[PDB]
Amino acid sequence: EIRPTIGQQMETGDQRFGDLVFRQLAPNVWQHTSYLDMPGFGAVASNGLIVRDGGRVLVVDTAWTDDQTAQILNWIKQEINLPVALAVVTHAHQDKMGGMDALHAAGIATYANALSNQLAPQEGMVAAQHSLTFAANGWVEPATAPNFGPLKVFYPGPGHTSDNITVGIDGTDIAFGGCLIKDSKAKSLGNLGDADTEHYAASARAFGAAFPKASMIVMSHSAPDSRAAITHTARMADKLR
């Protein structure tokens, strides 16, 4: 088993599949986890989501690489055997967007914040094929998110990056904070190299307010947590200003 240097460990409830780990969170929601082996440091886990919506599946975030992302698609084919309608990626960094080419080879429509698509080439990423735009209060413009089923996309403001977005899963008590939110026991806010240290706290809190009844908070580098992950992230971010 994979014991990452950074990221949650495997526990009861986890399925190893290839180089990845999958965990069912709800009857129709699974967390995908993939690992980047960094030289001299060991594996860094990154999480995203798989959502069944009737006869189709929706994905939030790629794995770190194209091969890992193809493995996600193979797990979905094995375990669910329904087509992937679209994927939403939550900002233009490798943990979230490093597998875009596997999605595109598979014929899956991809969506990202317009700003993530504008940044991606500068980051050595491939842009998603469609751009999401957002209102002044952070809610996605619904015409840019056609047929998203239960995915409710919200741009909370700059934080981990200027383009980070978040996704609520309607019909469940789950919301996904991506790299913006760290868990309730975290000692750090992770990589702040692209962060907006003035606005981070307010953006973390805005994500909480967008999904006020979400009780299970999913994030990129820890196991799903309570709402304390939001409040503790904001308290850590208050110290950056």
Could you list the residues that contact ligand 0WO (CB under 6 A)?
A: 6, 36, 44, 93-95, 123-124, 179, 190-191, 220-221
| Choice between 95 and 183, CB closer to Zn ion | 95
Q: Closer to ligand 0WO by CB, 53 or 163: give it.
A: 163
**Residue closer to ligand 0WO (CB basis): 42 or 190:** 190
Q: How large is the C-alpha radius of gyration of the chain?
A: 16
CB of 13: closest distance to Zn ion in angstroms?
22
The least distance separating ligand 0WO from the CB of residue 65, rounded to whole angstroms, comes to: 11
The 3-state DSSP class for residue 208 equals: helix
8 touches Zn ion (CB under 5 A): no
Contact between 227 and Zn ion per CB under 5 A: no
Asked if 179 and 186 count as a contact pair (C-beta separation under 8 A), the reply is: no
Q: Is 232 in the site for Zn ion (CB under 5 A)?
A: no
Q: Does 93 bind Zn ion (CB under 5 A)?
A: yes
In the complex, what is the shortest distance from the CB of residue 145 to ligand 0WO, in angstroms, rounded to a whole number?
Answer: 24
Closest CB 152 distance from Zn ion, rounded Å: 21
Q: Is 130 marked as binding a ligand?
A: no
Nearer residue to Zn ion within complex by CB, 57 or 165 = 165
- Asked if 96 and 220 touch (Cβ cutoff 8 Å), the reply is yes
Q: How far apart are CA 168 and CA 172, in angstroms?
A: 8
Q: Is 191 annotated as a binding residue?
A: yes
Residue from 59, 60, 179, 229 touching Zn ion (CB under 5 A): that is 179
Smallest separation (angstroms) from ligand 0WO to the CB of 220: 5
Here the contacts of 76-84 (C-beta below 8 Å, separation 24 or greater) are 76/50, 78/17, 79/22, 80/50, 80/52, 82/52, 82/55, 82/56, 82/57, 83/55, 83/56, 83/57, 84/56, 84/57, 84/58, 84/59, 84/108
Q: Which amino acid is present at 98?
A: G
Picking from 61, 213, 218, 58, the residue whose alpha carbon sits closest to that of residue 148 is: 58
* Least Å from the CB of residue 30 to ligand 0WO: 20
The answer to whether 160 is a known ligand-binding residue is: yes
Tokens (6 digits) for 112: 């990202």
Smaller CB separation from ligand 0WO, 97 or 140: 97
| Interface contacts to Zn ion, rule CB under 5 A | 93, 95, 179, 220
- Residues forming the annotated binding site for Zn(2+)? 91, 93, 95, 160, 179, 221
- Residues forming the annotated binding site for substrate? 182, 191
